[PDB]
Symmetry: D2
Subunit: 115 residues, 4 copies
Amino acid sequence: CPLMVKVLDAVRGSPAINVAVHVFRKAADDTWEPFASGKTSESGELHGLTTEEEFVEGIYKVEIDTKSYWKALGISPFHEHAEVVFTANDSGPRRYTIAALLSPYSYSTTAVVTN
Amino acid sequence: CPLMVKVLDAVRGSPAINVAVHVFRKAADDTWEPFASGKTSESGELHGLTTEEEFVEGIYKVEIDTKSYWKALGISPFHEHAEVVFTANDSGPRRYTIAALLSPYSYSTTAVVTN
Amino acid sequence: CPLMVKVLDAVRGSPAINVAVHVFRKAADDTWEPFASGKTSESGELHGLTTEEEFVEGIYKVEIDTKSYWKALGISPFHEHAEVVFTANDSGPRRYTIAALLSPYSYSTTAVVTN
Amino acid sequence: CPLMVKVLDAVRGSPAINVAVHVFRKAADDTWEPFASGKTSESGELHGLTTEEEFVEGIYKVEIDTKSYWKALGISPFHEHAEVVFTANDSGPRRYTIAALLSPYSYSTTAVVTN
Ligand SMILES: O=C(O)CCO/N=C/c1cc(Br)cc(Br)c1O
Ligand SMILES: O=C(O)CCO/N=C/c1cc(Br)cc(Br)c1O
């Protein structure tokens, strides 16, 4: 699994479950093309978005739909979504974990990159 | 001043100076139209981007050029940029400060919305 | 002013107002001795804790009473307090700003060290 | 396993490996007594600190030795350590994951608490 997403909720101290995630890849004409999508599980994780073969070099955007998550908990948050944009596999294949820690008016995102 | 940006460097414990910042407004055709831009000051701040008159309700994006910042420091970064996407709302407080705390493989962003 | 504290609330997107903050110095017997304290202002800031004359090199602890802050908002928190422990050094810049970004089950802290 | 620690490095985008962790528990005389200790693994994780039987209600302090970690990478960081202080098991047994994301002049810590 070369691209994984993990989302945590900093208000509740829990995984952020059922968070929609959309992944896009920049095309040769410089526009964002759909690449994969899914929803976080009960553990706040999203696996199985892509394969090593499909996950070629490129610029990828991982959009985490945080606004819908908070609205469903009764909270009107600040951001529309959290966007994570990065070049992938430009020095050969890697495994990426994109993690996000969510609060209504703040989020943090990190990447863990392994061989 | 209704919209300010503050950028900090978590590696050096300092303001992030001379970071390019672009602000976009979402247009009716769903595309991002340039709105304002600048470079952070020696205090890591960018003021004077817009006026109360111009900063009407809508969806805005603040794009912080983090990749060029880390490249100048000789540190290999993960993200192409940091993106902050939000709705400006007239029902809340009048000043929006978008703050970002930068590391090579991580960033945090918060919104401080005050009167 | 060589030591300042700034506290933000990531749930409300606001300064964290009226938060108690205690500063301690490590004594020669390795115990923490009270040094200075106060409550954050309406801007979430606490200034005037010490002077350049008093703020000699040593190990200091800044304890932010986050539990009482969340209790006042009716939100169940995880931590008893946030603790920031550091060595003050005369070889670096002269002003230390200890910033903290608070959520019920998470906090971030950074140091902005400037001239 | 009711108490786990996970540490990430925000500069390198990797687990923080070989980080020393000391856990203390407040005794009836209000002093911190040693409770458990260990080091993070190649995955940045520390398991096996305690058992459900031993991990009774109390106030616990998890001290993550961040300064030694950074010094070994050639970096002189700001903090002496990251301290996480919390009441545990006061509404029955729970499972706690204490996570920390490290940068030289900043860290964030969250808790994931499960039944
Ligand atoms: O395994 C679990 O239950 C959660 C532990 O993983 N933590 C991830 C994580 C932690 C912090 Br602190 C900041 C960011 Br951004 C993260 O993505
Ligand atoms: O006075 C200064 O120099 C700036 C201090 O403000 N801190 C802001 C801030 C702190 C943390 Br922790 C995380 C995020 Br995101 C922030 O935006």
